[PDB]
Design a protein around this ligand. Structure first.
Ligand code: FPP
Ligand code: MG
Ligand code: MG
Length: 493
């Protein structure tokens, strides 16, 4: 067959082979400078785990020399190994997101907690946040506590502030698989005499999480998101492998009581991104076998829908997001009874397209992610008459943005002038596969050639990561590179 189909075949064999007999595709997160620095600061202050603190120090120095992250994370590591405001401004350089204000408060307080800068002179209510993702409440309370103690006003802390941190004292892996949240909570809790009896045992478990490279990962893993995305890719192949059934089973039995899905095993917080990938996959691979899970996931999404027609990530009443809205539109469009919500979601996407054809960055730090989600919703939901024209024009502007910013090597990076990476290019390919038929030398043709060229001898892909959290800080789940390139090649062939 073609080189693209040969490439797709080798990648599919590799992805199938990586799914375990439990139906899951393992998806560990790499060490990250931020969490490693916080783990270092916590263990150092507590004079615990000398072996672990030495490896963390070595990891941080090695990473800073050989693979330095964004300026904020570098400043954090330098603070702990020892222009903070300059690093904040550079790390949040034109971070254009509805959370920007919260993020500047958070990151500044992190740096101040580590002695790199002064604490923000804000009313304590600045740290108050409406209920959203479970662990976010804990992080904000931990930073409020650190600021109260750091500025010499410990009496400001109320019992309801401490109560928010109690999950950090539970044994075993971090609550909600989030090491950042537990590390921040523990840095705060070590200032409380009445919480100190529980600290010793958790510090031993923290220290036992170090990866072989001596670092601490952001999260314990991302196996639900990764397995669902890979199942979807595999289900779009001409003859899907048998393993889609155990993958569908493994996902369905992990559904949360609200009918949605978290990003990893043991994550009780559901989110629209995970849920939409699971729903799309189950719809194709197990619509009868898992009829009830499908219906519960649709019900989960509908109960999150915001009044403006968009969907938030975690909680109704937090800002709708374009990529989440497009994802939910595509995931809900399989039931003609949901057409009203689907159409309102697609209209939300069209209203929020930018004058240059783009949408926005959120959980992905490239522009191509939201383009691909938007284009799938704009072209996958059937529409006719005036509405067909409106959606086709918006999809055309998005695909034109892709063509206009395509790098000479045929790929795309995180931004118009960045070097190409396979993941960013994979998202663009999914979108462009909704455009005109590929032609020799055309944008889709060239993008597929780039992907063919970048395939490693072992059949896989190595890519700069695109996932951020907390936004805009990147974290690296290497398993996603193979999965999203496979999803692109499955869409494009
Ligand atoms: C699964 C997926 C890729 C979709 C997006 C949401 C999500 C569950 C991401 C997985 C990584 C993670 C646990 C970060 C939490 O972000 P945060 O709470 O630190 O983010 P914020 O501070 O920017 O709100
Ligand atoms: Mg957060
Ligand atoms: Mg977090």
């Amino acid at each position: 067959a073609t080189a693209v189909v040969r490439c797709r075949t080798r990648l599919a064999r590799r992805v199938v082979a990586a799914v375990g007999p439990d139906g899951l595709l393992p998806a560990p997160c790499e060490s990250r400078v931020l969490e490693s620095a916080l783990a270092l600061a916590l263990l150092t202050e507590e004079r615990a785990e000398a072996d672990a603190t030495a490896r963390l120090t070595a990891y941080l120095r090695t990473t800073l020399r050989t693979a330095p992250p964004d300026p904020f994370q570098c400043a954090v590591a330098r603070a702990v190994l020892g222009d903070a405001g300059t690093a904040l401004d550079a790390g949040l350089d034109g971070f254009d997101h509805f959370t920007a204000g919260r993020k500047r408060l958070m990151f500044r307080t992190v740096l101040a907690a580590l002695g790199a800068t002064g604490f923000p002179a804000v009313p304590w209510e600045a740290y108050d946040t409406r209920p959203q993702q479970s662990w976010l409440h804990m992080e904000m309370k931990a930073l409020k506590v650190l600021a109260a103690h750091g500025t010499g006003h410990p009496d400001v802390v109320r019992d309801e502030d401490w109560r928010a941190l109690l999950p950090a004292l539970e044994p075993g892996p971090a609550w909600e698989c989030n090491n950042l949240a537990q590390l921040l909570a523990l840095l705060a809790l070590r200032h409380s005499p009445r919480h100190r009896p529980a600290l010793g045992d958790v510090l031993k478990h923290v220290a036992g999480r170090l990866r072989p490279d001596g670092g601490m990962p952001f999260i314990d893993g991302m196996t639900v998101f990764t397995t669902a995305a890979a199942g979807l890719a595999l289900s779009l192949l001409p003859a899907p492998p048998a393993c889609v059934t155990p993958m569908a089973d493994a996902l369905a039995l992990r559904r949360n009581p609200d009918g949605g899905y978290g990003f990893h095993s043991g994550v009780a917080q559901s989110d629209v991104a995970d849920t939409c990938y699971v729903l799309e996959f189950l719809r194709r691979a197990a619509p009868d076998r898992h009829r009830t899970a499908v219906a519960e996931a649709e019900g989960y999404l509908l109960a999150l829908r915001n009044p403006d027609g968009g969907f938030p990530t975690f909680a109704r009443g937090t800002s709708s997001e374009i990529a989440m809205t497009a994802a939910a539109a595509s995931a809900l469009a399989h039931d003609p009874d949901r057409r009203e919500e689907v159409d309102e979601a697609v209209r939300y996407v069209v209203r929020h397209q930018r004058p240059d054809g783009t949408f926005e960055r959120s959980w992905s730090r490239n522009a191509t992610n939201a383009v691909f989600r938007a284009v799938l919703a704009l072209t996958g939901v059937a529409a006719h008459g005036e509405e067909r024209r409106s959606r086709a024009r918006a999809a055309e502007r998005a695909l034109a943005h892709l063509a206009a910013t395509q790098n000479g090597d045929g790929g795309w990076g995180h931004a118009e002038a960045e070097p190409s990476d396979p993941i960013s290019t994979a998202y663009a390919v999914i979108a462009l596969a909704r455009g005109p038929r590929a032609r020799p030398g055309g944008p889709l043709d060239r993008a597929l050639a780039y992907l063919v060229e970048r395939q490693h001898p072992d059949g896989g892909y190595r890519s700069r990561p695109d996932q951020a959290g907390p936004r805009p800080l990147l974290y690296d789940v290497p398993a996603l590179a193979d999965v999203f390139v496979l999803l692109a090649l499955a869409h494009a062939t």
